[PDB]
Design an enzyme around this catalytic site. Structure first.
Site, mmCIF file in Angstrom:
data_model
loop_
_atom_site.group_PDB
_atom_site.id
_atom_site.type_symbol
_atom_site.label_atom_id
_atom_site.label_comp_id
_atom_site.label_asym_id
_atom_site.label_seq_id
_atom_site.Cartn_x
_atom_site.Cartn_y
_atom_site.Cartn_z
ATOM 1 C CG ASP A 1 -2.335 -0.171 0.830
ATOM 2 O OD1 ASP A 1 -2.591 -0.739 -0.252
ATOM 3 O OD2 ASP A 1 -3.192 0.225 1.648
ATOM 4 C CG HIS B 1 -7.207 4.134 -5.631
ATOM 5 N ND1 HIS B 1 -8.248 4.744 -6.310
ATOM 6 C CD2 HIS B 1 -7.735 3.681 -4.465
ATOM 7 C CE1 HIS B 1 -9.359 4.639 -5.597
ATOM 8 N NE2 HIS B 1 -9.077 3.996 -4.475
ATOM 9 C CG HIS C 1 -7.060 -1.945 -5.126
ATOM 10 N ND1 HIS C 1 -8.266 -1.355 -4.811
ATOM 11 C CD2 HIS C 1 -6.921 -2.991 -4.276
ATOM 12 C CE1 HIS C 1 -8.827 -2.009 -3.810
ATOM 13 N NE2 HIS C 1 -8.022 -2.995 -3.456
HETATM 14 ZN ZN LIG Z 1 -4.470 1.646 -0.662
#
Ligand SMILES: [Zn+2]
Ligand SMILES: [Zn+2]
Ligand SMILES: [Zn+2]
Ligand SMILES: [Zn+2]
Ligand SMILES: [Zn+2]
Lengths: 367, 367, 367, 367, 367
Positions: free
Chosen positions: E171, E254, E257
């Protein structure tokens, strides 16, 4: 041959260190002859007595006669014997400290050395220069041991005239260049062997400390206050320069300094001031790169060290005077023969004249 | 507080230096107690006697009892008194040299120290470790003076098992990292003050000498011959590491070494071998950059020093054993509290486990 | 003392240069004795005769006897006198070229030197090695002049076995390290003075050319073709290495090469192959940094030069054999005493063993 | 101990940001007490009212009494209660913003802070300095929370006298050096823990932004216009310097600033102007390298910050005055004891005098 | 537009920080709803209760329902009202912490957030992800304030499975690349303005901390112990990555993802594991230099993060699946349009396939 480094047993430095003398000296001996001149005892004797008394030590105060002579050593030995002294404390400048070291050797007792100025590389060394009662140079006394203890009260040092700190910078400036010369030539040091890596590292640290801290330290010295820069330079002028010359080796700068006694002109200047110019001459002799000569001359000028003959009051009839200096610097037994590849008086004469010309150009460009 | 550096008065190193012992010792004293064990005197006593006799010195040979104990010191003092000895020469390894230093202190005479191996940082220091007659540790004897003279015959050293030179590398490897830690934290050294620039420079020179010369020196050691690389490493293992730890400061590596006596596992390993792993643990504790940990582990592996617990025969029940080591390393009075920012047993425990994991990964990648 | 550099009067190098011999030789002399062995004249005599004849020069072809001996020199002088030769051309390898140089000196005539291989540093030098008729070494003949002319036909050189070019690389590899050693120590060169900057620059160019071009040149040599890399290496092996050793100075590598005649083992190896290992030993002796030893060993290995004793067929009873080599390398008059700080047989013995250990490790790591 | 960083909840910066206050404040609370002095409301009240009204928020305008005092806080709390305010907006300079923060704490309501100048590191911090109604300093009010919102209208800031932006540069300049000192010593910050990496990074960004943008920003400030350089410096003076001092730590510079209230001389100078000289003194105290002191002094001089005592109107009887400043800077509880290795009044006194000498030399060289 | 940075009011991190919760929470509020799931309260509830009780605070323990849903928020609000709670403490992982933040907003009370793992960038942010009771995603709840307090007990974190720390690294790895992309494109952040220098500096510090400390930290995590490297990475995974994404900006990583929810394959993998591959894809999309892609892939592989589709169990029918992922990543409102120069589904599809090919090659070369 063997590689050898010598050192004082314990080197102590800090503000107010004189107040702790008693605690530092106690493990060495209980009864101390204290040798210092009237000026030094004038400001230090009360503190001295309190520190030693509070530690349970005895002190016999012996005002110094002024010369490190055989008569003075015998006079102080007689004084010490009446008080059954078992150790010697010298406090003050070079002549006092040389006397204390020589005295302690002849009594075979520990010696503690407390310089009140940081103007020469001598305090830590296993050397005493003997003079006549009249102050004429007599001989070099090679001592079998370095002082047991050297204690430098940097707040006392900061109170001395700033010119003396700059003179110490001049003495210490030679340390790296003379030790490097001896390492390259494989000359024997005064420690009696070839140079160690330890002494070379300490000598190079000396030089770099002067480059990094010399100007910062001079500002503190002129204000008579202690900053870390002044602390580092005092260490450089005393411990690093001391072990550096004795275990690293002497070369042209030292020999050129001694050669200037062949003329009267520079008598008003300090050992380290003459050594600064002798280092510049050495750089010419070894044909140091321009950047290196430049850096040394800039360092000298930034703390007021001389980089010309005129700044040593050596003026008029320069060819004659420098021939005299060059011949003396190259006499049998002088450390100039530690220079790589050997050097003769013709080469030294040339270097002296060219170094002076170079300092003259530097000063001019600086305006 | 004051900054203090201590040193032996004279450090001598070279091939065949034992043959010149007489000339080196003469200026100190005329009548020498010579302490060494049967093995050392077996190869050195004839050379010893000739050198001292040829210099006009007397020698009373006193085979060493094996332990640096109060009884052994008193036994040798009695022996020395019958021969009216005025100085002590210790020749051999650590226990012999500690005894000679302690004996010379209690007789108040000069001591000369002749290591025949370069396996620990101890010979130059003002320290004797006292043991019981049985060999159990008793106490630390802080001496008021470093040895007058340390004489290292590098051709004798080169004859010793190469593992002992690598062990000396392990001891000396800690020197820079422990002195740097103490400089950053402002811890007091065993010299009794804060770290000087001189000691820091010597400790850093120690580390760099090991990086540059360690592998070259091991090749000579394994061939039992003297090269300049071996000479530089012997100096690093003895003088630089000695002054470096005593005047530069001890920290986590030393305390972790002492903590391993809380378990039986590593009893077959030398001081310097355990100190090597303690240095890696210290690097974890101070979160050294990966490149630095990498370089230290590579240096260790290149000379056979351990970088894992298993290489110290510390195996099985590792959490329990490392908790024991960590608690002991953090006891009151241990030098681990010289680490910047303070350290507790939880942090040491973590560092021990992570350092071991790191050495395991290093060994694996190396194949 | 004076600084002196010597050189052949004219060094010529290029593909097909033999075809232009007549034009190059004409300004020197009109009537040439041509000395070469049966193999060299087998491939070169026709080209030789055409070039000289087309230029209006006379040639008396004199097949070489095989040894540079006083008898052979007198035989060729008698032959030359019958043809009223006024100059000497030597063409071929070392023994032929030494003979031509010595002959030209005793006749007091110009000499031109045409190496057909680039395997040694000798062709350009003012030196002839005299042997007995049997091939046993007799003496070194120092000539008062370098050859008037050296002419290197690189297409002839490229036709020689590639091993001979690598051997030349081994000879030339020593050039920088021996000249640097002599510059540092101030040793006298065979030119009879101290090293000049010119010779040092040429010796350093030699080394860097080998590093940059050695592998590229070997590829061409193995294919028997001329590329610029091979041209640069041929120049390095002949002119740069020639002037470099003679005017830059010889040191440990040369003396260790000569010391190997104290044992029979390496008789099948070329001068330059033994000199390669002698250079590695010299690097140990001067404690060269690991990177530098590493680079030299890598260069050697990349062209097949030996870096271990075993690669010179020196095997079994190594301590005895290396003691023999070390004592001979350190005999009175050997160039190993040009090393800075002096060297004795113990130090050479140690260096030999450690250099061999280092090459063994290098070879192992290389797989 | 724990590592802690504190920050305002939302930091907003841009030209015309005041026009968007209503939209920014709405999510926090609906009814705002607006505290500002007559000068600030003179130029901002109309814009303020429109932005809040257009967003559907209520505003009770409360002209500021001038001092951040307990009486003033109670007066404004009474005013706010009559309008049932549920939040506080402070707009203007330091005294106004401290009052708004303290008021919001005692009402337990959100606070929004709108500096109209970028002259100090205070706006973002969880701190209010309480004064008496008379303007005498009373106490430090540590707040449990940083402001919810800080809104910096850079076009309002650019309209302020340029001297105030340079003063902010002086405040922000200390940020990196004080946080670095606290990181090295492990001192506790006002956030109540040790320094985080985040705060250290922000403090170092502060310093580098001033070096890169300070002069570019001053040009815009003097022209009263907004450029990106001015935007970066405003962020550096406000957010980076705010979080940097509070979560990074205060040291000698802050303590020396406070010590100057022990003398009347510098009363006409701004917080950040005195902090600039305090930073130079800190650099002497930590013996910063000459290049670093040089860079800081050059930065100061380039934006008009003082680097000498005389530039703070501290003249005459300097030893007495600096002793007063040094003793006060070293009082119990002062942040000078966050300096690594501890500091006493003697060291601060020395640093003050040497820093002044250094600024005097800098100014002279600059002509 | 304006530049805006948001932060939690106070971020606290250290070993045993849970024991000090009471003292940290007291200045905020007196009566706390404590929300955590049965597993977290199983190990933490006793410590929690003692810390709050010893500080004189009330605690109402409310076992968490498991989903951050409107029903769960209303259930906890009802529970809190019966105990007259005036603040919310969430302790545990993401769903618990999102619930506590959302609950505190709807009650309008302070919230304190205690992550027990460092696996995502979410804890510090002003965001709650709302789910249905069934666990299906419902909506994004943008909160008007970041949490008042975030307290990270690193010894609790070190006890979690090491895979969760590596997921946090995944992350946090995106943070710099997404913030840099948004800085280059001038995209609006979730803080509602353009990126500040502060957020960019924190995001870049995040990345460099992972490069320097990631592997050192994983070793500690796998041993479940705390070292400084683990402390720095926990800060990077939590504070730096939190403020970095929210105030620095989100981009392709992001959005990629989120696009992977368009297929079922990677359901067993953590947010940060998918984000690691999304970052590699982003590097392809922005045509990052090979060295940079290389460094990121090496970092990922060194902590076990996936760099191929297969390492996310995305296998078979890759063109179809990546088209689905690419179209979803490019939907209206997705942060991929923050990439400089705009991006469409064709470019994302290409980047996905090429990034996977690149990870496949990396893994192969690594053997
Ligand atoms: Zn994240
Ligand atoms: Zn001197
Ligand atoms: Zn040790
Ligand atoms: Zn040769
Ligand atoms: Zn301030």
């Amino acid at each position: 041959m063997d590689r050898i480094i010598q050192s004082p047993g314990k080197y102590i430095q800090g503000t107010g260190a004189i107040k702790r003398l008693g605690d530092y000296l106690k493990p060495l001996a209980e009864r101390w002859l204290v040798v210092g001149d009237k000026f030094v005892l004038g400001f230090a004797e009360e503190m001295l007595r309190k520190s030693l008394a509070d530690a349970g030590l005895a002190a016999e105060i012996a005002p110094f006669g002024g010369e490190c002579s055989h008569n003075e050593i015998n006079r102080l030995r007689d004084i010490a014997g009446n008080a059954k002294c078992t150790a010697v404390l010298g406090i003050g400048g070079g002549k006092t400290l040389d006397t204390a070291k020589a005295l302690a050797h002849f009594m075979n007792v520990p010696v503690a050395i407390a310089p009140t100025i940081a103007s020469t590389d001598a305090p830590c060394s296993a050397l005493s220069v003997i003079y006549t009662d009249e102050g004429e140079f007599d001989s070099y006394l090679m001592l079998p041991r370095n002082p047991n203890m050297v204690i430098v009260d940097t707040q006392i040092v900061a109170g001395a005239p700033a010119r003396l700190l700059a003179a110490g910078i001049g003495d210490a400036l030679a340390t790296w260049f003379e030790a490097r010369a001896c390492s390259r030539s494989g000359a024997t040091t005064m420690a009696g062997g070839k140079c160690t890596q330890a002494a070379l590292a300490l000598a190079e640290l000396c030089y770099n400390t002067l480059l990094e801290e010399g100007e910062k330290a001079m500002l503190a010295a002129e204000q008579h206050v202690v900053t870390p820069a002044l602390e580092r330079v005092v260490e450089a002028n005393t411990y690093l320069s001391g072990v550096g010359f004795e275990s690293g080796g002497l070369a042209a700068a030292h020999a050129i300094h001694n050669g200037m006694t062949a003329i009267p002109d520079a008598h008003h200047y300090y050992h380290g001031e003459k050594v600064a110019f002798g280092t510049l001459t050495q750089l010419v002799l070894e044909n140091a790169p321009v950047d290196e000569i430049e850096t040394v001359a800039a360092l000298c000028h930034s703390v007021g060290l001389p980089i010309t003959l005129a700044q040593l009051d050596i003026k008029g009839d320069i060819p004659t005077k420098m021939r005299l200096v060059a011949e003396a610097a190259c006499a049998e037994g002088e450390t100039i023969h530690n220079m790589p590849g050997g050097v003769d008086s013709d080469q030294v004469y040339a270097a002296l004249l060219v170094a002076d010309q170079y300092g003259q150009r530097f000063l001019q460009e600086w305006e």
